[PDB]
Each structure stands twice: as structure tokens, then as C-alpha cells.
Nucleic acid binder design. Structure first.
Ligand SMILES: [Mg+2]
Ligand SMILES: [Mg+2]
Ligand SMILES: [Mg+2]
Ligand SMILES: [Mg+2]
Ligand SMILES: [Mg+2]
Ligand SMILES: [Mg+2]
Ligand SMILES: [Mg+2]
Ligand SMILES: [Mg+2]
Ligand SMILES: [Mg+2]
Ligand SMILES: [Mg+2]
Ligand SMILES: [Mg+2]
Ligand SMILES: [Mg+2]
Ligand SMILES: [Mg+2]
Ligand SMILES: [Mg+2]
Ligand SMILES: [Mg+2]
Ligand SMILES: [Mg+2]
Ligand SMILES: [Mg+2]
Ligand SMILES: [Mg+2]
Ligand SMILES: [Mg+2]
Ligand SMILES: [Mg+2]
Ligand SMILES: [Mg+2]
Ligand SMILES: [Mg+2]
Ligand SMILES: [Mg+2]
Ligand SMILES: [Mg+2]
Ligand SMILES: [Mg+2]
Ligand SMILES: [Mg+2]
Ligand SMILES: [Mg+2]
Ligand SMILES: [Mg+2]
Ligand SMILES: [Mg+2]
Lengths: 244, 23, 65, 181, 170
RNA sequence: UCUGGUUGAUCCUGCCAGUUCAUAUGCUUGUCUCAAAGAUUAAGCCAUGCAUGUCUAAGUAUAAGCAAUUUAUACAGUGAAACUGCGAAUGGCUCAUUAAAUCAGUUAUCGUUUAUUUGAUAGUUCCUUUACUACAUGGUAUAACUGUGGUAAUUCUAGAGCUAAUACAUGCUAAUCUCGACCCUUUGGAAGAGAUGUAUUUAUUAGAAAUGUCUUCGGACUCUUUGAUGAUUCAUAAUAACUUUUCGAAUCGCAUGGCCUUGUGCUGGCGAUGGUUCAUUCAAAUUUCUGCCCUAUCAACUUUCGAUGGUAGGAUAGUGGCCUACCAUGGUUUCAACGGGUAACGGGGAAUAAGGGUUCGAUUCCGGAGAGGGAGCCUGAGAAACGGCUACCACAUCCAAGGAAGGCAGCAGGCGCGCAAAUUACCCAAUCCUAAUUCAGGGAGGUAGUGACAAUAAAUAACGAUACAGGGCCCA
């Protein structure tokens, strides 16, 4: 091609959306945004295929142009806006707060949360660096830049972000015995505790995770998301608790 | 010694089916 | 028989959110009369061959002939 | 373009169609069960061949093997539900003993004949294709419809049928009108 | 006309490769900028993205640094005395990176006199060769900028082993 | 692969005879669901039509437009045209070229560019002509429009007159922070000593026994002072200059709140569009390792005109013989280099088979490449674009002969024979994409039509009564 693509065939769409192969020839191509194309759920899919509030794309546009949908507390009017893991979707008219978390199947679940839990989200620290004028900042998995972080925050840690202010309330270090959620691979959606982090310099780190049933599995460090201490997650978990 | 927030309560649906007969 | 049904909270909301063709079925809207796609596209191309309002072209051809 | 829609063939021509024993067997089957042509027998043979090949492959595997347990249990459940396999013969060894007559036994045509709604298999076929037979609340016009154990007791004449309580067909009321005239 | 693609070359084994495709815009080159001493003539180039490059077609001044003293002064360029890549560039007085040039000594001499009050003594002591050049009136400098890329002809005054090496080469 | 013969009767070796897929074609063709449409190695040539445009309250209307009005006093509703912005680099089609190339899996960018999206991010007080626009600068300016015209002819346009901007080009408006004597002992006051953006280019620099005393029993007394990576000349900061040198809001909608010393005073809400840098996302470009069919009656090849490497420069978004100058003489090869053939786009896949294997894969998804054949470019974040431009070759249309206009391997539909095969149909309602934008557009796509492509189910009859006759069938 001579430039960026703008279409997406249904057979080429992410499998976890569960799109009918004979419904049409194209799928909603997610727009650029906080989350990657293959790891995002566009708002059209969520509103039409999952919640069934809209019967087609036109009704989704009608809902969005009324400013009824908020994503992490901000009104979004783009049908293909890439909502992703740990995003909070608010529908005030229906009194609904949802958090996007994969289930054991590996698909984003329709998980309803309370307003108090909807007031915050979790972000995996992807980067920590000094910006201009020597101001430290952290970049999270959703692309948020947060300035003046706690000096203890390091990469692979999890920061609790208050959506109203976009500031760090608390954080969890990446360490053995911490509760982790799998966000990639065939173990996508499972929850467990870290047992060991195998280090290979110049290569990909491996993490061993043990679930409550004592089953152990190995995963790349990129696919691991610390969500709390064992027995004390910082977010409500979907049905199944990431077992199997 | 073993080292080991609540989800929103589900709601009964607001609306139910309605039946009518005529003729 | 099995089908789908919608009951809006107001007639104004129904007019606001319903598709135009369903409103036309129910008589809530009048069918807009338009030329066929081929006629509209040919007219668009003919207009595309003209720059500006085109009245000066008309007066020029009138003077020429 | 749109994604492809899958399809498959439901039958296969036999290895040597011209064996005299095979022709006589097909004659007997078609006559007994009122089948239209050899393609129906080939279809049932193809299905039974798939089933028995699967059962043989599972029997090859060790007992308590997860694949054997899972797939064999599913196969036995399906065969028992359709009525081909008896409840007391819930083993793959008896799955290997199945025959085409067992599957032809469950066709709606044979059931309609046997329940007494029809005096012949061909009368049963004519009744089914003419929309006189209902399995439960549903009118079924397919003779090859495979009847389940639960459905077996619900075969009757359709409410719309002249034989099921509706008004007489066109021939009857036409003759009545002529006679009255 | 200029392309930087590696497909037109022979393979490491020596095979002659066939044309895979037509030339692409993202592997182009442009004409060289043979910068020369004279009144400043610079023209902009629109490069990949909205970015711009500056082509120094002509330039006669530049910002040269005395690194021992830690200063920089803007000075006129007299001419190109030595170039390691090609002597034709010296012959034609073409300004490029690494070209050894002669610059006016006046601003550096004036700064030295003002700062040290001499034409304290220990700090005012400098290399004998540099002082000889100051007496001559011109200083040998090495151009550290790329005139055809940034439009600047900056550099630094040669000192120490580099100065001795280039004096030998001259 | 099996079957039967060749003997008086067997075994072995021979002979004889019978034993899906692809192409082309013949006949028949009622019902339901569903679905496809290549082929002269001719990537041969195409009449005609269409396939890419786009406007919100929110960039620019004195249309000599329409309609309104408390009948208008800068404008204000709606709005052709035109400027401005964005898109047109996506999609669709075809398989010509291409044999470590593409492609598949697997890597790197500590080797680079990236419109858009998402998140952050910019008080520089002062600094002589203050002889001062910021209660807001210019034409260094034009379109549409008015009017005068040329040509046979085209989405050809000339001369003259006007007028706008988020176009173009200029240009401004008593701050904050360190210490803090002295009072006062806190909710402290502050005489005074000091400090002050970005962007570009270069050079330099940084980035590594207080175990005590007192105290109110708390606390205070001296000291610390960058981060990351496996790894950096990294992030970042500092100094001195440099620059045809940037940026640091002269923009727009809706609404009219709060203070008063009552002034058209001061202040002030919710949005739109922009703007510097960094991060993110959508991408792009290169890139590590292993893997391709036939050919040895192709054994040496590359290196003169870059082949392998070194130094420097140029060019690039950037690495790099990518190119240049000077140097060496290297690099590949019987473990098949190089050359040749390919009815060679690669893969996921399809068929067959008991297994090993063999064949097919233009063809619904991914990647590559092309737009009659070579070559070069403008614009743009992104193209070596072809429903953009310029030349050459081959074809080819109009002409008043002076010129002017071309690219169906996009959707329909034609020629290529004198022998043949889907509709020049309807629509943006679904899928999604584009725009300034819910609305406009979309031969992308969908709907229907049309040779039994490949598949699914399945009618053309079912049940009776009576009469007559004695033969009917099977083996051999
Ligand atoms: Mg394309
Ligand atoms: Mg994994
Ligand atoms: Mg790494
Ligand atoms: Mg127009
Ligand atoms: Mg009926
Ligand atoms: Mg019918
Ligand atoms: Mg008006
Ligand atoms: Mg308006
Ligand atoms: Mg070859
Ligand atoms: Mg390779
Ligand atoms: Mg855009
Ligand atoms: Mg932004
Ligand atoms: Mg004029
Ligand atoms: Mg170099
Ligand atoms: Mg050379
Ligand atoms: Mg092939
Ligand atoms: Mg080929
Ligand atoms: Mg292929
Ligand atoms: Mg191309
Ligand atoms: Mg052609
Ligand atoms: Mg553009
Ligand atoms: Mg081209
Ligand atoms: Mg075309
Ligand atoms: Mg195109
Ligand atoms: Mg065509
Ligand atoms: Mg023909
Ligand atoms: Mg706007
Ligand atoms: Mg089409
Ligand atoms: Mg008939």
C-alpha cells in the first residue's frame, strides 16, 4: 500500500469480538487511540453486539451523538473508539458502569461495577522517564502520561489512577506473591499469583503463575498485569475469578 | 495460615412481557 | 409469527430516532421524490464540467451565436 | 467479498455398485422402507460408515483416555437420543454392531406407518409430503425426518389437516356442493 | 535520478539481481550541495515529513569554537586548505564537514586580550603553534557541521595532536 | 488393482481380453435452501455510461438568491458560487515480472520518519527614539462576481474593475521563585542579597562509632541530594556563541453570570479550531536466523564501468559501496557458486493416500507487485500515484489541418472468427469507509436477473370394491 489502511475485512478482525462471518464484508476498524487494534473493543461492538442497546451502526451513532457514553469519565462520540482492558464505560441514562476485563474464554466480558469502583482504574507502568525540565513521568498501558510519580514506581508496577483528576492514588510493585491477570497468549483471562520471574537478558522474561487450584503456567512478562495482593484484588473480578 | 471490591448487584429486569387477545 | 417491536416513550422521540423508511411506511413522513441514481450522477458530472455559476458562459455563447 | 459458506456431500457412491448381492440388498431395503432411489441408501450408508469409523478409532485408544471418554460418551448419547442405540447397550462395542436398518427404522415415514396413521410406507410418505403429519405442534413434510425417543409419542395428524379436525379438502367440499346442487 | 536502493547492486556471491520493482520515493537521493565561499546563498529543501533541510550553496562566515578556552566566535572563512576525502574540493574551495579551513583570528585575539589582559600569565600561556598562527593572522580550523544539511558552517580551531597531524599533512 | 484363458493336473515367468479427477461437449431440466462465475502463457485492444467527494451553532456571503422580521442600521434565518480545510496514498481488479527475490515463522531499530487518535506540556517583570496599534496591523491580494474578448474544438482561458479569511504577510500587551537581618514568637511581617523562555547548529561539562547532646520526651542540633538499560556519547541538565530560523492564539459558536467608587468600568461560564515538545496509537522503511521446482552435456564466478573491506565526505528520514575520492585484494564455490528453464506471485489451504509420499493452489483471508511498455516528477504526513502530471515507443479519437484530447488487469458492456453464453438492471436499507460532517457520497458493498459451477431437501400419486381366467414363477 501507499499509505495507512482504513478498512478491515471481517475474517481479518480479532476473533474475540465474535463477529458473524456472513453479516457483512467488513468489520469496524478501530481508530487510533489509547489501545492497540488487536487488543481493543470498539464502542460499536460493545454497544451493538454485547449490550444489544443498538440494532445497527446508525443507532450506535445516534446514541453517541447524544453524548450518553463516557469512557474513563470523558464523553466519546466516535463509533470505532478503541476501548480496551481496564477501561470504564459509563452510561448514566441506564445507570450502568462497566469495566472491560477478559473472561476465562479470553473475550471481553460485560462486567458491571459500582460508581465507587468506576471512579478509578488500574494502569500497568510501561515506562518511567524524565521529560523536559527534569520532570519525571510514567507512561501506562493506556498511553496516559502522569507527571511527578512516586520515586518508588518502576516498570511493570501497577498504578491506581483516579479518573476525575487523572492522578496516581496508590501503586503495587511487581513481586512474587502478587496477584496477576493474564492479558495475552493462550492463558489470556486467567488470574493467579506470581511464583517466580525468570530473567533472560537480551530476551523475553518469563513469569510462573500459580492459580488458586494450584495449577502452574508460564507466560511472557509482557502479558502479565499486577492487580493486587493475593486474596485482595484492587478491582472486582468477573464470574469465574480467572479459573481454568 | 493461608495468605488467601464487590461487583454491582444484579437487577431484576424493569420490564416484563405483556399479553393481549382480540377477536 | 415472530417479529421485533419498538415502543418509544413519545411520538417526537419516535420521529427523532426511527429510520426514514419505517416512518414512510407508517405515514409519519412523506416519501421524498428524487431522480434515479444514474440521472443524479450524470447531472453531477455535467455540473463538474462547469466552473463558477456559468451565467457568463451562457451570455458568451449567446453573443457568439 | 463475503466469507464463504461451508457445504458438504451427504452421500458417496459405493465401491462396486454392480454386485448382485448389493443390488438385491438395495431392492429389499427400498421395498421394505419405501425409499425413492439408491441415493437415500447411499446417504444412510455414508453416515453409518462415519459413525462406525469413529467408534473403531475410539476403541483403538486406551480405556480412560480423555479423548476416548469424551468423544465416545458424546457419540453414545447422540445414538441413544435418536433411538438407534438402546439404553442397555451404551458401549462403543454395540456402536460397531449398528446397521442401516436401525437408522431407516427411525425415519418419520416408518414411524408414521408403524403407529397406524398409515396403511403402508408409501401411504405414510404421501401423508407426510401432503402436510398431514405433525410431530408435536410442528408440521413436518420431510419423510427422512429422524424421530427422537421423546418425539415418538407426539406424532399425530396436524390441526390443519382434514384428518386432524379441519374442514374437508377441496375434493370433498366440491363433491358436496355438486351433490347439493 | 539518484536512488539509494541496494537491489541494483550485485549479490555478495557476485550474482546479477533482477529488477524487483520500480524505484520508490522513500529511497531517493538528491543532488550534492557543493558549498563555496561567497555571499550567503541558502535554499530550503522539503524532506520526508514536513521536515526541512537547509542547503548552503554559498557561505563565508561560521561559528568556530576555541575548545581549550571554551568559547565560540563568529568568523569569516578565508579558504579551504586541506580536505581528507578529495583534493579537488580543496582546489575548488568546496566547504564540507572535516574540511580544514583558514579563519580570521581577530575575534579570538580580541577576546584573549580582553580576558587575560595580554597580547594569570600561566593561564594566558597557550600552545606555541596557535600563537604563531595568531601572529600570522589566520587560524586553522576544522569544519564540524554539514553545510548541505543544516546550512551552517560551524567548526572548531585545531589544537594539539590534531593540529600537529594536519601541519604535517599540509 | 482383480477376473478368464494358454496343461492330462499344479507352481513359476510371459502373452492375450475386460476391468475418481481435469478439459471439451450432447440430451433433459418442475419445487425449497445455498452458492460460484479466470484462462489464446492474448498483463491483447476498447465505443458508451458510471465508479471520490465533502459543511457543523461553531473558518470566509451586501448572490444585484430565497424567505422572513416588532419592516430591519455592521452581521445574524437558509444558502448556489468561490476561497479555505480535509480526503482523493483507502477500496476494487490482475498475476506480467520476480528463484534467497517475494513469502512463512522468528528477530532488531542503542539505525529512522510517522497526518490522525489518546495523555501530558509553553505567565520568560525589566531592559533608552515611551516620538508607543493591542479596545487588535497590512495588500506587500485575490477567487467567486461585474464588464470587454480570442479559438472549429476541450473541466482552454486573456485584458480591466471589485471584495473577505483559521488564506497570505507582519506584530505587542505590574510576574514568579530562593534565601533572608531585624522585630514578633505565630495562620507571622519583610529592610535587603539574588535567579529567570523554546526551536536550529557547533564546541565543552555533569549524568557517581551524631552508637553524641539536650529536650517538653515528642522533637531539634551536623550530613545526604538525579533515574533507566544486558549494554550507550541514554533520559535530562549546564556553559559559550550561532541562525535569510521557528514556536510562544490579531481565530470561531452559544450564554449573559459576579463585583463595585455607576463607568457601554473590572471580571467571568460551556464549547470549536489551532499550536511547541514528549509519550501513545494507526503506519512505514530497513533488518537477524532457517526454509524454494528442473538443469553438471552449466565448474568456476564477481572485480576495466563497485565486486569484498578500510578512512573520510556527500546523499538520505535514517544504517549501509547508496554514491564519490584515496587505499588494500578481497568475496562466493562439488555442503553445487555462477549461468540456463520455469504453462514460478508466496502462504493459509485443496485432492488423493493405510502410512510414507505425489499433485494442485490466477481464484472469498494475509503479504508482494502492476496499471499498454520504459524514464522522471509536483503535491502531500504518506505516492515514484497513473479514474495526477511531463517526455519517448506502440496503438488510437476529433479537427475548419492551425491544433486538441488518450489509457476498463474498477462495475456493466464490446472486439480479438465467419462458429457465439450473466445485467450497458435497482439501491445506499444492512456491512463498513470518507468529509467541515448523525444528514452528503460510495458499480466498496448489498438486492434482484441470467447456461443444471459445487452442494442441501424433495413431488410426478395413495387407498379400496367388483368381474373373469387357469396357469404363474425358479433351477438346469
Ligand atoms: Mg490497494
Ligand atoms: Mg504465552
Ligand atoms: Mg531489548
Ligand atoms: Mg460545485
Ligand atoms: Mg394446509
Ligand atoms: Mg410452493
Ligand atoms: Mg444575509
Ligand atoms: Mg447558516
Ligand atoms: Mg533463473
Ligand atoms: Mg533469506
Ligand atoms: Mg482527518
Ligand atoms: Mg494532542
Ligand atoms: Mg483583476
Ligand atoms: Mg559513512
Ligand atoms: Mg569509488
Ligand atoms: Mg506454481
Ligand atoms: Mg508468470
Ligand atoms: Mg495464490
Ligand atoms: Mg503501485
Ligand atoms: Mg490492457
Ligand atoms: Mg492530503
Ligand atoms: Mg506511473
Ligand atoms: Mg481506469
Ligand atoms: Mg487508483
Ligand atoms: Mg469489465
Ligand atoms: Mg467474441
Ligand atoms: Mg469547524
Ligand atoms: Mg463489485
Ligand atoms: Mg410433471
Amino acid at each position: 500500500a501507499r499509505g495507512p489502511k482504513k478498512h478491515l475485512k471481517r475474517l481479518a478482525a480479532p476473533h474475540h469480538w465474535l463477529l458473524d462471518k456472513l453479516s457483512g464484508c467488513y468489520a469496524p476498524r478501530p481508530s487510533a487511540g489509547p489501545h492497540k487494534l488487536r487488543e481493543s473493543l470498539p464502542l460499536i461492538v460493545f454497544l451493538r453486539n454485547r449490550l444489544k442497546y443498538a440494532l445497527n451502526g446508525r443507532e450506535v451513532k445516534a446514541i453517541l451523538m447524544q453524548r450518553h457514553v463516557k469512557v474513563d469519565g470523558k464523553v466519546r462520540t466516535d463509533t470505532t473508539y478503541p476501548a480496551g482492558f481496564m477501561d470504564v464505560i459509563t452510561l448514566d441514562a441506564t445507570n450502568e458502569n462497566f469495566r472491560l476485563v477478559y473472561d476465562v474464554k479470553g473475550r471481553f466480558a460485560v462486567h458491571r461495577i459500582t460508581d465507587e469502583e468506576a471512579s478509578y482504574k488500574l494502569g500497568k507502568v510501561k515506562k518511567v522517564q524524565l521529560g523536559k525540565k527534569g520532570v519525571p513521568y510514567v507512561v501506562t498501558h493506556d498511553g496516559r502520561t502522569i507527571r511527578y510519580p512516586d520515586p518508588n514506581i518502576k516498570v511493570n508496577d501497577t498504578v491506581k489512577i483516579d479518573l476525575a483528576s487523572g492522578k496516581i492514588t496508590d501503586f503495587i510493585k511487581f513481586d512474587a506473591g502478587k496477584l496477576v491477570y493474564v492479558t495475552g497468549g493462550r492463558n489470556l483471562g486467567r488470574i493467579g499469583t506470581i511464583v517466580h520471574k525468570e530473567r533472560h537478558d537480551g530476551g523475553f522474561d518469563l513469569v510462573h503463575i500459580k492459580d488458586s487450584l494450584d495449577n502452574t503456567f508460564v507466560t511472557r512478562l509482557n502479558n502479565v498485569f499486577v492487580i493486587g495482593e493475593q486474596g485482595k484484588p484492587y478491582i472486582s473480578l468477573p464470574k469465574g475469578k480467572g479459573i481454568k | 495460615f493461608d495468605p488467601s471490591p464487590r461487583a454491582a448487584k444484579k437487577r431484576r429486569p424493569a420490564a416484563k412481557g405483556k399479553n393481549l387477545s382480540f377477536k | 409469527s415472530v417479529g421485533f417491536g419498538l415502543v418509544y416513550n413519545s411520538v417526537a422521540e419516535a420521529k427523532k430516532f426511527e429510520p426514514t423508511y419505517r416512518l414512510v411506511r407508517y405515514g409519519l413522513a412523506e416519501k421524498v421524490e428524487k431522480a434515479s441514481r444514474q440521472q443524479r450522477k450524470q447531472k453531477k458530472n455535467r455540473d463538474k464540467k462547469i466552473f463558477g455559476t456559468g451565467k457568463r458562459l451562457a451570455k458568451k455563447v449567446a453573443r457568439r451565436n | 467479498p463475503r466469507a464463504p459458506r461451508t457445504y458438504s456431500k451427504t452421500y458417496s457412491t459405493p465401491k462396486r455398485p454392480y454386485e448382485s448381492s448389493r443390488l438385491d440388498a438395495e431392492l429389499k431395503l427400498a421395498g421394505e422402507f419405501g425409499l425413492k432411489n439408491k441415493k437415500e441408501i447411499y446417504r444412510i450408508s455414508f453416515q453409518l460408515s462415519k459413525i462406525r469409523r469413529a467408534a473403531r478409532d475410539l476403541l483403538t485408544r486406551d480405556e480412560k483416555d480423555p479423548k476416548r471418554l469424551f468423544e465416545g460418551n458424546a457419540l453414545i448419547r447422540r445414538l441413544v437420543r435418536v433411538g438407534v442405540l438402546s439404553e442397555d447397550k451404551k458401549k462403543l462395542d454395540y456402536v460397531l454392531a449398528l446397521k442401516v436398518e436401525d437408522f431407516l427404522e427411525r425415519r418419520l415415514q416408518t414411524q408414521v406407518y408403524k403407529l397406524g396413521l398409515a396403511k403402508s410406507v408409501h401411504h405414510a410418505r404421501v401423508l407426510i409430503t401432503q402436510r398431514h403429519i405433525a410431530v408435536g405442534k410442528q408440521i413436518v413434510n420431510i419423510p427422512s425426518f429422524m424421530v427422537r425417543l421423546d418425539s415418538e409419542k407426539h406424532i399425530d395428524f396436524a390441526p390443519t389437516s382434514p384428518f386432524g379436525g379441519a374442514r374437508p379438502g377441496r375434493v370433498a367440499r366440491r363433491n358436496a356442493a355438486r351433490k347439493a346442487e | 535520478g539518484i536512488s539509494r536502493d541496494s537491489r541494483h547492486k550485485r549479490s555478495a556471491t557476485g550474482a546479477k539481481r533482477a529488477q524487483f520493482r520500480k524505484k520508490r520515493k522513500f529511497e531517493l537521493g538528491r543532488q550534492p550541495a557543493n558549498t563555496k565561499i561567497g555571499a550567503k546563498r541558502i535554499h530550503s529543501v522539503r524532506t520526508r515529513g514536513g521536515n526541512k533541510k537547509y542547503r548552503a550553496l554559498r557561505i563565508e562566515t561560521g561559528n568556530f569554537s576555541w575548545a581549550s578556552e571554551g568559547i565560540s566566535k563568529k568568523t569569516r572563512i578565508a579558504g579551504v586548505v586541506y580536505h581528507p576525502s578529495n583534493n579537488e574540493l580543496v582546489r575548488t574551495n568546496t566547504l564540507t564537514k572535516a574540511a580544514i579551513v583558514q579563519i580570521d583570528a581577530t575575534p579570538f585575539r580580541q577576546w584573549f586580550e580582553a580576558h587575560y589582559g595580554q597580547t594569570r600569565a600561566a593561564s594566558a600561556k597557550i600552545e606555541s603553534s596557535v600563537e604563531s598562527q595568531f601572529s600570522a593572522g589566520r587560524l586553522y580550523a576544522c569544519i564540524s557541521s554539514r553545510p548541505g544539511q543544516s546550512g551552517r558552517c560551524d567548526g572548531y580551531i585545531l589544537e594539539g595532536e590534531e593540529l600537529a597531524f594536519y601541519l604535517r599533512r599540509l
